[PDB]
Design a protein around this motif. Sequence first.
Motif, PDB file in Angstrom:
ATOM      1  N   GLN A 283      45.298  60.510  28.792  1.00  0.00           N
ATOM      2  CA  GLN A 283      45.847  60.119  29.882  1.00  0.00           C
ATOM      3  C   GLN A 283      45.380  61.036  31.068  1.00  0.00           C
ATOM      4  OE1 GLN A 283      48.149  59.309  33.281  1.00  0.00           O
ATOM      5  NE2 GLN A 283      48.563  61.129  31.806  1.00  0.00           N
ATOM      6  N   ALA A 285      46.601  62.611  33.657  1.00  0.00           N
ATOM      7  CA  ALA A 285      47.622  63.579  34.308  1.00  0.00           C
ATOM      8  C   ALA A 285      48.463  64.512  33.097  1.00  0.00           C
ATOM      9  CB  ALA A 285      49.072  62.902  34.843  1.00  0.00           C
ATOM     10  N   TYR A 286      48.565  64.013  31.807  1.00  0.00           N
ATOM     11  CA  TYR A 286      48.806  64.868  30.952  1.00  0.00           C
ATOM     12  C   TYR A 286      48.407  64.802  29.758  1.00  0.00           C
ATOM     13  CZ  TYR A 286      51.770  60.572  29.981  1.00  0.00           C
ATOM     14  OH  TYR A 286      51.924  59.205  29.600  1.00  0.00           O
ATOM     15  N   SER A 310      43.006  66.105  37.728  1.00  0.00           N
ATOM     16  CA  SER A 310      44.236  65.280  37.641  1.00  0.00           C
ATOM     17  C   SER A 310      45.367  65.840  36.637  1.00  0.00           C
ATOM     18  CB  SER A 310      43.845  63.979  37.239  1.00  0.00           C
ATOM     19  OG  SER A 310      42.832  63.686  36.125  1.00  0.00           O
TER      20      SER A 310
ATOM     21  N   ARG B 101      54.608  55.820  34.172  1.00  0.00           N
ATOM     22  CA  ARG B 101      54.774  56.690  33.010  1.00  0.00           C
ATOM     23  C   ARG B 101      54.656  58.229  33.394  1.00  0.00           C
ATOM     24  NH1 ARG B 101      49.374  55.432  29.004  1.00  0.00           N
ATOM     25  NH2 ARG B 101      49.833  57.476  28.665  1.00  0.00           N
ATOM     26  N   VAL B 102      53.916  58.584  34.140  1.00  0.00           N
ATOM     27  CA  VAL B 102      53.667  60.197  34.499  1.00  0.00           C
ATOM     28  C   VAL B 102      55.082  60.689  34.891  1.00  0.00           C
ATOM     29  CG1 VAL B 102      52.480  61.602  35.832  1.00  0.00           C
ATOM     30  CG2 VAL B 102      51.243  59.500  35.076  1.00  0.00           C
ATOM     31  N   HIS B 105      57.041  61.100  32.462  1.00  0.00           N
ATOM     32  CA  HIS B 105      56.896  62.089  31.457  1.00  0.00           C
ATOM     33  C   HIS B 105      57.271  63.453  31.883  1.00  0.00           C
ATOM     34  CE1 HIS B 105      53.997  64.842  29.355  1.00  0.00           C
ATOM     35  NE2 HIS B 105      53.892  63.738  28.366  1.00  0.00           N
ATOM     36  N   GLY B 108      53.810  65.314  33.242  1.00  0.00           N
ATOM     37  CA  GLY B 108      52.816  65.232  34.175  1.00  0.00           C
ATOM     38  C   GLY B 108      53.526  65.449  35.516  1.00  0.00           C
ATOM     39  N   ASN B 109      52.897  65.445  36.632  1.00  0.00           N
ATOM     40  CA  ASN B 109      53.459  65.117  38.143  1.00  0.00           C
ATOM     41  C   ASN B 109      52.509  64.258  38.896  1.00  0.00           C
ATOM     42  OD1 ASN B 109      50.941  67.060  38.284  1.00  0.00           O
ATOM     43  ND2 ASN B 109      51.822  67.669  40.289  1.00  0.00           N
ATOM     44  N   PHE B 110      51.235  64.008  38.484  1.00  0.00           N
ATOM     45  CA  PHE B 110      50.302  63.027  39.116  1.00  0.00           C
ATOM     46  C   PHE B 110      50.671  61.769  39.095  1.00  0.00           C
ATOM     47  CE2 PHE B 110      45.696  61.586  39.724  1.00  0.00           C
ATOM     48  CZ  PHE B 110      45.643  61.914  41.008  1.00  0.00           C
ATOM     49  N   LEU B 112      51.246  57.944  39.517  1.00  0.00           N
ATOM     50  CA  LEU B 112      50.194  56.865  39.405  1.00  0.00           C
ATOM     51  C   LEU B 112      50.143  56.130  40.806  1.00  0.00           C
ATOM     52  CD1 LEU B 112      50.430  55.322  35.935  1.00  0.00           C
ATOM     53  CD2 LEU B 112      48.686  56.503  36.770  1.00  0.00           C
TER      54      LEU B 112
END
Lengths: 374, 374
Positions: A283, A285-286, A310, B101-102, B105, B108-110, B112
């Motif tokens: 994925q 972003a993470y 990203s 989902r980001v 999460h 993550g911070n990016f 979608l």
Amino acid sequence: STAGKVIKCKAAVLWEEKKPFSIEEVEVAPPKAHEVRIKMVATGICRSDDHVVSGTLVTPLPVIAGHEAAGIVESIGEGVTTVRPGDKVIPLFTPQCGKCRVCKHPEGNFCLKNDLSMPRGTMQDGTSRFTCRGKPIHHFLGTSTFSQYTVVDEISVAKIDAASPLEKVCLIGCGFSTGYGSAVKVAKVTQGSTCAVFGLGGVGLSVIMGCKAAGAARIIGVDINKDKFAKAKEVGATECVNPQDYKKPIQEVLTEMSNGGVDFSFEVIGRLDTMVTALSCCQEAYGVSVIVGVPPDSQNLSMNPMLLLSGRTWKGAIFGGFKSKDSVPKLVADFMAKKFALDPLITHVLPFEKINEGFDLLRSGESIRTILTF
Amino acid sequence: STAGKVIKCKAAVLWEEKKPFSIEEVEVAPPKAHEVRIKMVATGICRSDDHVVSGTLVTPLPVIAGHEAAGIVESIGEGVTTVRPGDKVIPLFTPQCGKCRVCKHPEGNFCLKNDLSMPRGTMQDGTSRFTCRGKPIHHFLGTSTFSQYTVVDEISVAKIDAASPLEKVCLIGCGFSTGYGSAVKVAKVTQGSTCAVFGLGGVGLSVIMGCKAAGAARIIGVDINKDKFAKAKEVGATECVNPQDYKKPIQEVLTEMSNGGVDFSFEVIGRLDTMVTALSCCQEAYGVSVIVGVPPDSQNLSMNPMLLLSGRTWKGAIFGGFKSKDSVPKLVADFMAKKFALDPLITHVLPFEKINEGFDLLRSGESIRTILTF
Ligand SMILES: NC(=O)c1ccc[n+]([C@@H]2O[C@H](COP(=O)([O-])OP(=O)(O)OC[C@H]3O[C@@H](n4cnc5c(N)ncnc54)[C@H](O)[C@@H]3O)[C@@H](O)[C@H]2O)c1
Ligand SMILES: NC(=O)c1ccc[n+]([C@@H]2O[C@H](COP(=O)([O-])OP(=O)(O)OC[C@H]3O[C@@H](n4cnc5c(N)ncnc54)[C@H](O)[C@@H]3O)[C@@H](O)[C@H]2O)c1
Ligand SMILES: [Zn+2]
Ligand SMILES: [Zn+2]
Ligand SMILES: [Zn+2]
Ligand SMILES: [Zn+2]
């Protein structure tokens, strides 16, 4: 008795690249201070030993290869305090000197005394212990286990449980600890995650074992040899994909299957193209992608750095991130307490004298791990 | 007064790559449902805005660029619950929709719903709120702050403290939070480490500020423009090195200086060679390298995967890894509590009309951050 004298015994010498191993008599010098001479009992055939034959992993020739093994200490040189004659031991291809910057760091394990980044093919003092036909023969990563006897430095050997089955725990000397540690220590797979594993040989099946133990909810095995899939499902894979079945690139398939990317991916083959594919299917972003496969000497891959901008993490590791001498004893103890199984990885057991047959099994794709017995 | 009506105001339009910004009169449509119209008070010039001009960062043209800014809510569309007219706000080039989902999460911070991976240059609904000479003008990253008024989606705006000095805290909209979070949140710099920072512009100096706030014992700034060294030391660099003074590669210089490699390195320029150089100078068994710089569109770097196999970690991030809507209010509050300085980064404050002069300061290497005020 042999203490103090040269042993003449058989060993598998690789005189030239891309040749069969020649099984012949060699002379194994006695140990010097802080060295340990070991009678080999069992040694596994790892794909890194075939990398030497093909010239993918460069180390000085002629050499006695072999590094995933277990045996019994025949004698110790002066100054040795951590093993005694009669101890069961596993030689460590990644040393733990205990004194360098990496050994004193809490997280690193690639000890600066290793012979893997700039291979000399010698003991820590610059000399060899092997002579065959009058010529000196090189060591391989301070282990050289395709011989009935070998000599290693103390920093490259760990004493293990005296009840250990050596024909099974030799895989903790490399393949198992590497794959298991890449999942639980290097990538730190989380409970509930989707993981993708590229390559389902001995080390890839150990990565699936480590992901199952970290509680991953979905584990996708990827291999072009569909015969590897039944064994992959048996040790934990929830589904298996063969890249050859598809008309679209596999990172697309894997991104659509995991609904925009897996949490963790592992490259366990050693190809430049699959390392970039493994990164891309996590994925953006993470996702975390870990390289375990050994790449061909001196070749560069090409990739687009936006894959990392990203938010992806890309990392690699030797020996599953484990400090070798600290971990190998504790991993044998957990085997003993039945915390993981080694038996699914062993598909063939052959006498040492059949080493060339063992390598053809690997190359033809018929074995996962072949153990050679002495 | 203006609510519900089209406003005609000045904005800096970029009509073509490599041309100056044209100060024009544009019409800004009113906020539709869940959008917010903001009166701009101050916006910084970030190198990513110069990347659109040079063609390095491809986005649909014509465009109103600008993304680092602070202003006041002039009106709100139907259904907005998080701000009200008269609120001080910072637009967010990385949205936080809260539902993908980001966003769900923890790390993550990016989000979608960003317009950075495949830029359409529109509002979330596919349309533009800007017209100039009868032509529609594209938005840039849902922000477009080089304009007296702009309209953003509610997921791209954060309400901040009413007592904020807007001409200072517009830096939290990008440069500062990116460099600061890259150090304390993405790389997670440790007390006592050695860090090396490639690039001493506004973001690179905010990375030095995060490393110092995280406790680094040594912070080596690297820049080819030696005039940046004074300010780098002022904000925390212990030493600065200029690559042109040396006869040997700077990766060798930095590995010698740090006794085998730094603990954390950061690329804060945007060049493919320094991204590989920044990775190679961090320690091979446990070093971490973070790419912050935006690379030139569609170009691949080349590197040898053995740099990762030994144990290194390579990561990148957008906006310092911060979830934007959650974090920006909190960083303003901390700014108010005197927890970090923004003043060292502002070297020039110009009227909005002198925007091209501000871009020439950056390109000649004479400014760190220039703020344009409206
Ligand atoms: N990092 C370390 O410390 C470490 C330790 C042990 C082994 N290794 C390396 O890990 C890799 C795997 O070792 P192994 O002994 O498990 O090897 P193996 O040959 O048993 O397994 C490799 C697997 O990859 C599959 N494969 C080949 N090409 C493929 C392709 N293009 N797409 C998908 N699958 C493909 C093969 O079919 C095979 O099942 C090797 O490169 C080895 O050198 C690294
Ligand atoms: N990841 C993100 O979210 C994010 C956010 C903001 C900015 N950026 C990117 O970060 C980079 C830096 O932004 P900035 O506004 O601080 O830029 P800047 O232009 O102010 O600073 C760049 C610095 O790098 C130096 N430099 C150029 N070439 C060099 C080289 N060959 N070797 C050493 N130093 C060199 C320049 O002298 C300058 O001091 C840009 O690429 C920008 O697009 C990324
Ligand atoms: Zn191996
Ligand atoms: Zn060491
Ligand atoms: Zn910016
Ligand atoms: Zn979101």
